[PDB]
């Protein structure tokens, strides 16, 4: 699945090293993981929960926190922020 991230998502991807405009969904998830971990956004004692109200990720996703157990919810938040091209 090939996607074109919208400006805020693109900015977050590039902030962890990405240098292009079109990505696979695998790449988008990879870079978002790198972003979450470098920014230390997951709770050290409840590690499936991401806290993002003090981060651009929270602006992107429109939530102050989320769980990585919630796959459908996360896909929705990501898809809102890109255009799928195939």
């Amino acid at each position: 699945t090939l996607v074109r991230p919208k400006p805020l998502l693109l900015k977050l991807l590039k902030s962890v090293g990405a240098q292009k405009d079109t990505y696979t969904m695998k790449e988008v998830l990879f870079y978002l993981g790198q972003y979450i971990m470098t920014k230390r956004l997951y709770d050290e004692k409840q590690q499936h929960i991401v806290y993002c109200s003090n981060d651009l990720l929270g602006d992107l996703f429109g939530v102050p926190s989320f769980s990585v157990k919630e796959h459908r919810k996360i896909y929705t938040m990501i898809y809102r922020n890109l255009v799928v091209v195939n």
Binding site: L29, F30, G33, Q34, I36, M37, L41, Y42, Q47, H48, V50, S67, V68, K69, H71
Partner: peptide, 14 residues
Amino acid sequence: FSDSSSVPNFFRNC
């Protein structure tokens, strides 16, 4: 993107 026990396990080797 399949082990959801923790953010590092969800991303490791993915």
